[PDB]
Amino acid sequence: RSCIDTIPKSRCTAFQCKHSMKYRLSFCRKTCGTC
Ligand SMILES: [Li+]
Numbered sequence: 001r002s003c004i005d006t007i008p009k010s011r012c013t014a015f016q017c018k019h020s021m022k023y024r025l026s027f028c029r030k031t032c033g034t035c
Pocket residue numbers: 010
């Protein structure tokens with residue numbers, strides 16, 4: 001599986017996924033639902 005978060009997912013906060021492109025696209029692609 002290629003779809004992963006690159007940081008601990010406890011820090012892949014909904015707060016960040018909603019509005020930070022770096023979270024959506026770099027750090028939290030899985031938890032934010034990009035992949
Ligand atoms: Li936890």
